[PDB]
Design a protein around this ligand. Structure first.
Ligand SMILES: CCCCCCCCCCCCCCCCCC(=O)OC[C@H](COP(=O)([O-])OCC(O)COP(=O)([O-])OC[C@@H](COC(=O)CCCCCCCCCCCCCCCCC)OC(=O)CCCCCCCCCCCCCCCCC)OC(=O)CCCCCCCCCCCCCCCCC
Ligand SMILES: CCCCCCCCCCCCCCCCCC(=O)OC[C@H](COP(=O)([O-])OCC[N+](C)(C)C)OC(=O)CCCCCCCCCCCCCCCCC
Ligand SMILES: CCCCCCCCCCCCCCCCCC(=O)OC[C@H](COP(=O)(O)OCCN)OC(=O)CCCCCCCCCCCCCCCCC
Ligand SMILES: CCCCCCCCCCCCCCCCCC(=O)OC[C@H](COP(=O)(O)OCCN)OC(=O)CCCCCCCCCCCCCCCCC
Ligand SMILES: CCCCCCCCCCCCCCCCCC(=O)OC[C@H](COP(=O)(O)OCCN)OC(=O)CCCCCCCCCCCCCCCCC
Ligand SMILES: CCCCCCCCCCCCCCCCCC(=O)OC[C@H](COP(=O)(O)OCCN)OC(=O)CCCCCCCCCCCCCCCCC
Ligand SMILES: CCCCCCCCCCCCO[C@@H]1O[C@H](CO)[C@@H](O[C@H]2O[C@H](CO)[C@@H](O)[C@H](O)[C@H]2O)[C@H](O)[C@H]1O
Ligand SMILES: CCCCCCCCCCCCO[C@@H]1O[C@H](CO)[C@@H](O[C@H]2O[C@H](CO)[C@@H](O)[C@H](O)[C@H]2O)[C@H](O)[C@H]1O
Ligand SMILES: CCCCCCCCCCCCO[C@@H]1O[C@H](CO)[C@@H](O[C@H]2O[C@H](CO)[C@@H](O)[C@H](O)[C@H]2O)[C@H](O)[C@H]1O
Ligand SMILES: CCCCCCCCCCCCO[C@@H]1O[C@H](CO)[C@@H](O[C@H]2O[C@H](CO)[C@@H](O)[C@H](O)[C@H]2O)[C@H](O)[C@H]1O
Ligand SMILES: Nc1nc2c(ncn2[C@@H]2O[C@H](COP(=O)(O)OP(=O)(O)OP(=O)(O)O)[C@@H](O)[C@H]2O)c(=O)[nH]1
Ligand SMILES: [Mg+2]
Lengths: 459, 51, 347, 320, 98, 111, 48, 63
């Protein structure tokens, strides 16, 4: 992975040694080049994973997440450079440095072979993320959002640290390849119940599981755009990726320990989907949409079937691009009217025709129109949960109806109807904004032509 | 050029990273041509099966 | 103080500590504490004010009481073993008395009350010595007598200090009191692991000293003793706020920073001994410290507090304080995690 | 050797350099009292260093190239505005007074540092000891609020206690009707708007509080407008003083080493002039202070520590 | 109250530069910023990256498996063998308990 | 006794001067040099190159010996462990290993 | 002569610069010789 | 990389990790025995040194 770690590190001297007026041009260009080289991780085999060294390996799960991570960095620089224009040069470079350091931690997190190494990098991503929200967030409540984000994570991740160290004492290793062969079944006992909870709760809080999700709508409403993009696109998936790995060593206890969390997710997705119908803040609505989509991923991971694991992987990639798009679309309205209230600016299709097309395409992927990878992932999960229990189709089906209602409600309210009379500063869409939208949707829709590369190891 | 010398930092980081990844392989050759699946005889001019 | 006298008094503080660390005889250990306590009082008093006199007196009474209890343990040990060798004690009552005496000297809860008051009442440089160098001599005795220490007593002292230190710091706006309660909590980690692996005690002590020295040095560079005063740093030395932010996050135990290392290794050693409830309770309780470290970062670096007009006059003059070793200390305080296996040098 | 404990240990002790001519002299009086001319004559005749009264731009004169900086870098304090609009809602009146006290505190530190490092005495025009007469006058005319006075006394309490008082206080006693006569003659348009009541309050503070206080600890010499023209007689009075009071008699090399360590560190001198007391007159919002600070760093020779500015011709930076 | 700067007015980039791409105020920097994004984003990563994915050599051995399955089905049916057996592993290699 | 590197440590190979850990120690020394420039408001990258060089050299010099002790202490740990295992064969019996054909594991269906 | 007062670091402290560079040079020679003597002692003790 | 290189590189990784895991388990077992029995170089707490003892004839005989 050094071929990706080192050029990612080199982005920092590049940004600090650039001409004052070329920091965005240089950092954007070269992080796109890094993104290009990340397609070499597609050398995946039918049986064995791509095992680079003692520290890092890649397989069909981490590879799509790695490519999404490295693609998002140039998109985040594009999205941020406008609202940061007044910021002084040194603080602009510090912002870019936090984004670069976040990518470095993420690519190491997704390829770490040893689980304790994964833990440290999994935890390291908090620091830059918290700095981005609290330092460059706009409103007073970013400080509270920083605290809720920090302490929800640590409340769960500290027990995970104890469990992981305990496993290494008992098994002798935390290398994931070793655990694949030395895994022993988890017997029933109260000690093992709490070992299971310690191994899972940290990832649940990040997903987030319904009931532990209240930190996420806060974080989004306060974060700058780049913070929201990385939060929705990648940082939520640290939980899913972690769960997909650690469930290896929790069998067969997961058979019954998953029940409370399947109930929370199955009922949670309908609650959060219903909540979206009444949200008044556009960022908050998109945030609640994420909780509903990720509730599907939790269920898929917990029932552990080949179809559910393939659907979970596709959903994680598909949601990453869609939710990042939706935040970017909402932000482009914010940069004009400086309010997140959904009902403030209406009938924008009359004033911004092409931006309304991006709004339509994003909404259609959010409601999972076939054959988008959003639908492929959701469908594979629905198929597998039907076998788990036929009654789940009723809950899955109801959520599909509610998802369409709130996705189109968001499109109708902001883009259709009559424009607001007094809002007279809706200037035409910039080339930057249009390019940013298309750099989300185009790879998303292109993936429909070759979905296998985002279906994960079980493919 | 003093204008465009910063543009080699990341490309050279990739070349250095690529090179160090190959160096890493030289330390993991304990089973080169020794696995039951792929073990074979060397070709007349072959020194090693892979590097 | 005359500069030569100040040097000789500083060297006597160090010499008293060194005597404790090189002695094999219990009397010499006691002498080292006596000499060390005699030499430290003048630097608590050096600014001559009622607050510094109260702190010096409160400090004297605590340390003198602890030294009397220590000499009792030594004499009881002599009665029941006929020897003075510094090692395990040979009588459980002697062990409790020495453990309690050393807990009092370290300011561990529930013998902690003097630490916030004495630190508040003395200059920053004196507080720096009080909360770092002065921990060396008592910890080095605990390093040698730990086989005979009552496990329940030491772990109770540790748990109380982590709770008291964590809760006490939540209510503080004075930087010296924040450091005092932070010190109390960190002592608890050091003694909790001592029965299992004293090496990890040394690791925690060394790293704690490094981060504590960094913070005190950064406070001294700007002459800041209160939260609100520290909140003016952004409008004077912006680099300092970034260093303070990084160091505080390290003292919070956040990966990938150096301060994660001692908590990480202590949890490992305790789990190897099938201690699971205690390390988990300690780690969760240490979130209290992270909270009031984070509060300082909000008011120092991550937000810009209101300034004063006279601050503009400060823009025209450079920092002239020594800030000795600060660039090295801050880098060690934050960037040492990749070198964690180096802890074996302490074995 | 830059001064410090090492220099002190090696024999750089104040009592060596200081003679019976190593005296700090301050000249005080009301506005237009002629103290400026008397101060220069005293300094010339006794061979002392003269410090012109510290104004709004005193600190600029001691740093950089020595030239005054734009007004936004002093907070937009304006003595002219004070006369035009002493009751302005923008708080200019006290912001000026707080700034002027800090300027005088800095100058007093410079004067003591000169005295302790060279042994040559100094002559000052007003000081941090007499600065309060203007604040009392301001308060009594209703130009500043009571909370401004409380803030002023806090800053003075924790700053003036560190320094020694002048050896000699020279007061020039010009009555208010004469002062107003000299103000109109001077013909400064803004100054003529001064009220005799403001001038009478300045005199009341001087004679009610200042002179009685300094008499306990200094040598206080008083002259009228006529007696102040005879500079030789004033200098004759100074040279015949006994110096039998004050804390300058208690000083010794040890105490003067601590004092010199303080006055040479200007940031330590000004430490308490910015105590976090959020008085509206002196509080600056974060956005403004941030913007002004970035502008200051862009001024010539101000980005880096003195001697490290390539834009003003500093050399050998890679070996410094 | 205090001395604070007023909120600045939001500036429309199109006023000074009607050709603005929305990247930078400097027209020369603005155009270059547009060019790297469009060239490295669309011409390189998306076009060449899509082409690269389209020609991945038998990703995860799906094509080899189909060829191998055809070979086994041919050989097994020629020799009258079951196409597939319930037992993944040879029973003679397994020692059951009791 | 009270020795940083006892004489028996000389039988071990020295750390290479290109050790990745030693390079990181050197990088930490470089970072300290820049932070020194920053806190004193000098040009961060150019100011005092003589000082920047000694920061790197000092870190590397001390780092080299600390790495040497680190490796020696782990060699001693392995030496002690293996000797103790030889001295007490009864506590470390050579395990009787069965194949998975003979070992019975319960099957837990995921249905 | 831009500065009204002479800066404390107007010109380099040549003695300090000589000490600094001399210390760096000495430390490298000592380290290099130490490494060589370590490599030879290692080879002797192990017979290589 | 060809599949053979990755396959055999994987084996080299597995061998190193498996050997480390066994050593980790043995160390925990060795430490447990040394601490309980005191017969090893670890957990060797000092006892008084017998070279401090004076063996010469004393002022009185019975000792
Ligand atoms: C492996 C684990 C991780 C790594 C562990 C590494 C541990 C740290 C290693 C030691 C690092 C010490 C700092 C390196 C020196 C950098 C400063 C420097 O170049 O001073 C040059 C020094 C003066 O530099 P300067 O212009 O005053 O600036 C001082 C810095 O701001 C700085 O001034 P200061 O106030 O911070 O004081 C620094 C120095 C005191 O300042 C000095 O005089 C330099 C002495 C550094 C000695 C380094 C020895 C390292 C080898 C150990 C054997 O302190 C010491 O004496 C070192 C103990 O020139 C010399 O006289 C050379 C020393 C001659 C003997
Ligand atoms: C009808 C058009 C013809 C056609 O199907 O095209 C041929 C193929 C599909 O048909 P095919 O599978 O039969 O391949 C054709 C070539 N042969 C015949 C040799 C097999 O098209 C593609 O495969 C395009 C796949 C594009 C996927 C990559 C998108 C760009 C990725 C950029 C990375 C950044 C975005 C973030 C990614 C997230 C993580 C993955
Ligand atoms: C806040 C204040 C409360 C602090 C937490 C309270 C302690 C809770 C402890 C739960 C019980 C875990 C335990 O003690 O198990 C001990 C036991 C060790 O015995 P051993 O010999 O190693 O193996 C055989 C098993 N008897 O077996 C084990 O070691 C298995 C336990 C593995 C490690 C458990 C990690 C901590 C579990 C508690 C947290 C789980 C819930 C997390 C919820 C977070 C929500 C955000
Ligand atoms: C490893 C950590 C090393 C820590 C080194 C820190 C050096 C001291 C901090 C440097 C800041 C500049 C300075 O001079 O320190 C302040 C203080 C001197 O006090 P000051 O008020 O400046 O004036 C003294 C005259 N009365 O300086 C002092 O009085 C020294 C106090 C610090 C000594 C204790 C250091 C911690 C213990 C180190 C052992 C490491 C194991
Ligand atoms: C390598 C393996 C180990 C990995 C562990 C991770 C280590 C990372 C921590 C390293 C130690 C901290 C060193 C940070 C150096 C900071 C220097 C810097 O970036 O510039 C500070 C900046 C400069 O401001 P100034 O002095 O005025 O000069 C410019 C003139 N306008 O001052 C400012 O402009 C202030 C800007 C506002 C503050 C924003 C803070 C967010 C950025 C945080 C960066 C530091 C990271 C902290 C967390 C660690
Ligand atoms: C192999 C290469 C790898 C490089 C990446 C390594 C990252 C790990 C090391 C990070 C640890 C901190 C590094 C030391 C900080 C030195 C920079 C600094 O503190 O000052 C910022 C400086 C501001 O510029 P200047 O106009 O000169 O103002 C100086 C203010 N006194 O900045 C400058 O203009 C000088 C130019 C270099 C500045 C680099 C700033 C890095 C910021 C790090 C942020 C924290 C890590 C995330
Ligand atoms: C032996 C240990 C020391 C190793 C040191 C190795 C690197 C030494 C670099 C010395 C030259 C540094 O160069 C110094 O810093 C930067 C980058 O050049 C320059 O200033 C910079 O300003 C801005 C960025 O802030 C940009 O326009 C551009 O990067 C550059 O002009 C200074 O004008 C120059 O004086
Ligand atoms: C279950 C696993 C995760 C559990 C995580 C729970 C740990 C605590 C997380 C939040 C910590 C925030 O710490 C503190 O919380 C309170 C509210 O809770 C905040 O306070 C906020 O809510 C309170 C109560 O309504 C209000 O009085 C206050 O005006 C408001 O600002 C504080 O400003 C914040 O400093
Ligand atoms: C494999 C690595 C790929 C990396 C790709 C990186 C793309 C970077 C795009 C850089 C954009 C060009 O950057 C800019 O180009 C012109 C011409 O060369 C330079 O030179 C310019 O200077 C002045 C303008 O003030 C004029 O003479 C003229 O416009 C031009 O010559 C600029 O000084 C430089 O800032
Ligand atoms: C905090 C109080 C401060 C004031 C302290 C007052 C002085 C205390 C004097 C303690 C000296 C007595 O100490 C005590 O003596 C008795 C006499 O055999 C010892 O012996 C006692 O317990 C052990 C248990 O195995 C056995 O010897 C026996 O059961 C019993 O006689 C105790 O092990 C020892 O703890
Ligand atoms: N508000 C305020 N004004 C001050 C202060 N010190 C000086 N000034 C003003 O600065 C101006 C000049 O002061 P003076 O020295 O007394 O007048 P001068 O005629 O130039 O000098 P003399 O002839 O000696 O009297 C006057 O308008 C003073 O009111 C002060 O501390 N506060
Ligand atoms: Mg005058």
């Amino acid at each position: 992975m050094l071929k990706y770690i080192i050029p990612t590190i080199m982005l920092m001297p590049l940004t600090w040694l650039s001409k004052n007026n070329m920091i965005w041009v240089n950092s954007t260009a070269h992080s796109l080049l890094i993104s290009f080289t990340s397609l070499l991780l597609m050398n995946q085999f039918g049986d064995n994973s791509l095992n680079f060294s003692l520290l890092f390996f890649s397989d069909s799960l981490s590879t799509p997440l790695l490519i999404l991570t490295m693609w998002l960095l140039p998109l985040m620089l594009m999205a941020s450079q406008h609202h940061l224009s007044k910021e002084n040069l040194t603080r602009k470079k510090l912002f870019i440095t936090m984004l670069i350091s976040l990518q470095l931690f993420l690519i190491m997190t997704f390829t770490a072979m040893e689980l304790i190494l994964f833990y440290i990098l999994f935890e390291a991503t908090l620091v830059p993320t918290l700095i981005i929200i609290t330092r460059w967030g706009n409103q007073t409540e970013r400080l509270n959002a920083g605290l809720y984000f920090l302490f929800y994570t640590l409340a769960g991740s500290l027990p995970l640290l104890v469990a992981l160290i305990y496993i290494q004492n008992t098994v002798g290793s935390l290398n994931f390849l070793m655990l694949q062969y030395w895994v022993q079944p988890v017997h029933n006992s109260w000690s093992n119940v709490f070992m299971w909870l310690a191994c899972m709760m940290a990832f649940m809080v990040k997903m987030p599981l319904y009931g532990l999700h209240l930190w996420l709508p806060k974080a989004h409403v306060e974060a700058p755009i780049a913070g929201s993009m990385v939060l929705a696109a990648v940082l939520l998936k640290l939980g899913g990726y972690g769960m997909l790995r650690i469930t290896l060593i929790l069998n067969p206890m997961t058979d019954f320990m998953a029940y409370p969390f399947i109930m929370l997710s199955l009922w949670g997705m309908i609650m959060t989907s219903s909540i979206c119908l009444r949200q008044t803040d556009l960022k908050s609505l998109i945030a609640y949409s994420s909780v509903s989509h990720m509730a599907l991923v939790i269920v898929a991971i917990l029932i552990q079937t080949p179809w559910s694991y393939m659907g979970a992987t596709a959903l994680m990639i598909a949601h990453g691009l869609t939710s990042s798009m939706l935040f970017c679309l909402a932000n482009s309205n914010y940069e004009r009217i400086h309010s997140r209230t959904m009902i403030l600016a209406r009938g924008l299709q009359t004033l911004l025709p092409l931006m309304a097309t991006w709004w339509l395409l994003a909404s259609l992927t959010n409601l999972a129109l076939p054959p988008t990878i959003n639908l492929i992932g959701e469908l594979f999960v629905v198929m597998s949960t039907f076998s788990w229990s036929n009654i789940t189709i009723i809950l899955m089906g109801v959520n599909m109806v509610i998802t369409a209602l709130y996705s189109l409600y968001m499109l109708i309210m902001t883009q259709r109807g009559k424009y607001t009379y007094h809002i007279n500063n809706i200037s035409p869409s910039f080339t930057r904004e249009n390019a940013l939208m298309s750099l989300h949707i185009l790879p998303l829709l292109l993936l429909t032509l070759n979905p296998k590369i985002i279906l994960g190891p079980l493919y | 050029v003093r204008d465009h010398w910063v543009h080699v930092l990341v490309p050279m980081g990739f070349v250095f990273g690529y090179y160090l990844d190959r160096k890493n392989d030289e330390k993991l050759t304990a089973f080169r041509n020794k696995s039951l699946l792929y073990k074979r005889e060397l070709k007349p001019n072959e020194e090693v099966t892979w590097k | 103080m005359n500069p030569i006298i100040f040097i000789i008094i500083l060297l006597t503080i160090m010499l008293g500590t060194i005597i404790v660390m090189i002695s094999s005889h219990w009397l010499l250990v006691w002498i080292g504490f006596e000499m060390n306590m005699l030499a430290i009082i003048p630097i608590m008093m050096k600014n001559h004010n009622p607050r510094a006199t109260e702190a010096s007196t409160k400090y004297f009474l605590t340390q003198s009481t602890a030294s009397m209890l220590l000499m009792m343990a030594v004499i009881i040990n002599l009665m029941f073993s006929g020897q003075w060798t510094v090692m395990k004690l040979f009588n459980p009552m002697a062990s409790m008395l020495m453990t309690m005496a050393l807990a009092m000297k370290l300011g561990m809860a529930p013998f902690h009350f003097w630490v916030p008051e004495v630190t508040q009442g003395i200059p920053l440089s004196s507080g720096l010595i009080l909360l770092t160098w002065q921990k060396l001599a008592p910890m080095s005795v605990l390093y040698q007598i730990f086989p005979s220490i009552n496990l329940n007593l030491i772990l109770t002292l540790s748990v109380l200090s982590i709770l008291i230190g964590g809760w006490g710091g939540l209510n503080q706006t004075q930087l010296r009191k924040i450091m005092a309660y932070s010190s109390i909590a960190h002592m608890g980690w050091m003694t909790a692991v001592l029965p299992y692996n004293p090496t990890m005690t040394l690791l925690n002590l060394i790293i704690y000293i490094i981060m504590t020295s960094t913070m005190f040095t950064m406070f001294m560079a700007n002459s800041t003793t209160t939260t609100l005063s520290l909140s003016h740093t952004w409008n004077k030395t912006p680099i300092m706020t970034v260093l303070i932010l990084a160091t505080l996050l390290s003292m919070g135990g956040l990966p990938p920073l150096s301060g994660f290392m001692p908590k990480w290794m202590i949890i490992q050693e305790m789990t190897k001994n099938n201690s699971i409830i205690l390390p988990t309770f300690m780690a969760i309780t240490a979130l209290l410290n992270l909270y009031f470290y984070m509060r300082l970062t909000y008011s120092t670096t991550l937000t810009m507090f209101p300034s004063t007009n006279n601050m503009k006059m400060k823009w025209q003059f450079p920092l002239m304080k020594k800030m000795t070793f600060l660039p090295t200390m801050v880098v060690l305080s934050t960037m040492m995690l990749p070198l964690t296996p180096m802890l074996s040098v302490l074995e | 050797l830059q001064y410090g404990p090492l220099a002190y240990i090696l024999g750089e002790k104040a009592t060596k350099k200081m003679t019976e001519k190593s005296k700090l002299i301050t000249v005080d009086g009301n506005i237009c009292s002629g103290k400026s001319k008397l101060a220069k004559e005293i300094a010339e005749k006794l061979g002392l260093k003269h410090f012109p009264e510290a104004g709004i731009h005193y600190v600029d004169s001691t740093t950089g190239d020595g030239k005054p900086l734009p007004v936004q870098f002093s907070g937009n304090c304006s003595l002219e505005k004070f006369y035009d609009d002493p009751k302005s809602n923008d708080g200019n009146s006290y912001r000026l007074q707080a700034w002027l006290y800090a300027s005088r505190l800095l100058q007093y530190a410079d004067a003591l540092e000169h005295l302790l490092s060279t042994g040559q005495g100094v002559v000052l025009e007003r000081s941090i000891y007499s600065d309060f007469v203007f604040l009392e006058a301001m308060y009594r005319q209703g130009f500043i609020r009571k909370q401004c006075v409380d803030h002023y006394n806090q800053v003075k309490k924790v700053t003036i206690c560190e320094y020694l008082p002048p050896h000699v206080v020279v007061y020039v006693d010009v009555p208010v009707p004469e002062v107003q006569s000299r103000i109109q003659k001077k013909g400064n348009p803004h100054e003529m708007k001064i009220t005799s009541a403001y001038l009478q309050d300045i005199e009341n503070a001087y004679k009610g509080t200042f002179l009685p206080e300094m008499s306990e600890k200094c040598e206080v010499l008083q002259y009228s407008a006529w007696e102040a023209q005879d500079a030789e007689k004033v200098v004759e009075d100074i040279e015949y003083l006994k110096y039998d009071k004050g804390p300058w008699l208690d000083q010794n090399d040890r105490k003067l080493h601590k004092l010199r360590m303080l006055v040479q560190d200007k940031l330590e001198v000004l430490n308490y002039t910015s105590i976090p007391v959020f008085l509206p007159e002196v509080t600056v919002g974060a956005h403004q202070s941030d913007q002004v600070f970035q502008e200051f760093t862009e001024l010539p020779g101000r980005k880096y520590r003195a001697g490290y500015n390539e834009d003003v011709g500093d050399k050998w930076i890679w070996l410094k | 109250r205090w001395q604070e700067d007023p909120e600045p007015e939001d500036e429309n980039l199109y006023e000074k530069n009607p050709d603005s791409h929305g990247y930078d105020k400097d027209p020369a920097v603005d155009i270059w910023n547009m060019r790297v994004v469009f060239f490295f984003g669309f011409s390189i990563v998306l076009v060449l990256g899509s082409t690269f994915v389209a020609y991945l050599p038998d990703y995860r051995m799906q094509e080899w498996a189909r060829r191998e399955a055809e070979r086994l089905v041919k050989y097994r049916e020629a020799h009258g063998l079951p196409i597939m057996e319930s037992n993944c592993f040879d029973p003679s290699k397994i020692q059951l308990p009791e | 006794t009270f020795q940083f590197l006892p004489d028996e440590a000389r039988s071990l190979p020295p750390p290479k001067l290109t050790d990745p850990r030693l390079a990181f120690v050197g990088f930490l020394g470089y970072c300290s040099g820049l932070i020194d420039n920053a806190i004193r408001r000098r040009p961060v990258l150019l100011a005092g190159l003589h000082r920047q060089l000694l920061y790197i050299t000092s870190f590397v010099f001390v780092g080299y010996y600390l790495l040497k002790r680190q490796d020696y202490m782990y060699a001693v740990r392995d030496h002690d462990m293996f000797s103790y295992i030889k001295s007490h064969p009864e506590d470390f019996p050579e395990k009787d290993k069965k194949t998975y054909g003979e070992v019975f594991e319960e099957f837990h269906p995921v249905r | 002569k831009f500065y009204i007062q002479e800066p404390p670091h107007g010109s380099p402290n040549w003695l300090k610069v000589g000490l600094t560079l001399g210390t760096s040079v000495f430390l490298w020679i000592y380290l290099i010789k130490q490494h060589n003597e370590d490599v030879l002692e290692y080879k002797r003790r192990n017979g290589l | 990389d060809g599949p053979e290189k990755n396959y055999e590189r994987t084996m080299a990784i597995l061998q190193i990790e498996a050997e480390k895991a066994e050593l980790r388990l043995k160390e925990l077992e060795v430490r447990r025995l040394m601490r309980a029995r005191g017969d090893g170089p670890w957990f060797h707490y000092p006892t008084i040194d017998k070279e401090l003892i004076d063996h010469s004839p004393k002022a009185t005989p019975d000792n």
